[PDB]
Structure 1
């Protein structure tokens, strides 16, 4: 289920974080507008950068927290406000988050593993709704 998937991802978080974020960047190349220093790089080049590993893992450290605090794939309102108010998210719209969650769900569906893809899809939609409610355009 969803809870086991959190334990699975946390068990190899630096590789799942990198693979899912690369799935997102390759699926939605225009999302590089928010990640200038990742332009014109192969996946292997990105995975060699200190910063890439360290920023993507920290992102997923918080994503797993938010997942873990959710009830029935409904995230806390306090976690959504933090994500809207964060200065690093100043320009973003819910569309940025929707795309990340589509890529994560498709990564899960294509994996060999018994991830609860439908729970991550609901989680993504509930998080987008909570970001909207907390004031993200």
Structure 2
């Protein structure tokens, strides 16, 4: 289920984080509006860019903590407020997060691994709801 998937992801997290964020950027290329330094690069070139690897893994480090702290795929309100307030997230909207989680769910479905894709779909939805409640537009 969802808790086991957090452990699975954590066991190879730099790879999963980069592959999922690449699936997001390739499904929604306009999102690079918020990632101008990743423009004009293939997947293999991004995986050789230090901030791409370090920032993507740090994003997913925290994503796994928020998932682990959640109850039945519902994140803590303190985590949603942290994600709305962080300066790095200024001017993001909830649709940016919805799209990341569509790509994450599609990645899991395409995997041959028994990820609980429905629970990640729920978590993405519930995160978007918590972000909205905490003031993200």
1:2-44: per-residue Cα shift (whole Å, max 9, x none)?
Answer: 0000000000000000000000000000000000000010000
Partner of 1:107: 107
1:73-92: per-residue Cα shift (whole Å, max 9, x none)?
Answer: 00000000000000000010
1:21-74: per-residue Cα shift (whole Å, max 9, x none)?
Answer: 000000000000000000010000000011111000000000000000000000
Q: CA RMSD in A?
A: 0.3
Return the TM-score normalized by structure 2.
1.00
Partner of 2:87: 87
Gaps of 5+ in 2: none
Aligned length: 137
Hey, which bits of structure 1, 4+ residues long, moved more than 6 A? none
Gaps of 5+ in 1: none
Return the TM-score normalized by structure 1.
1.00
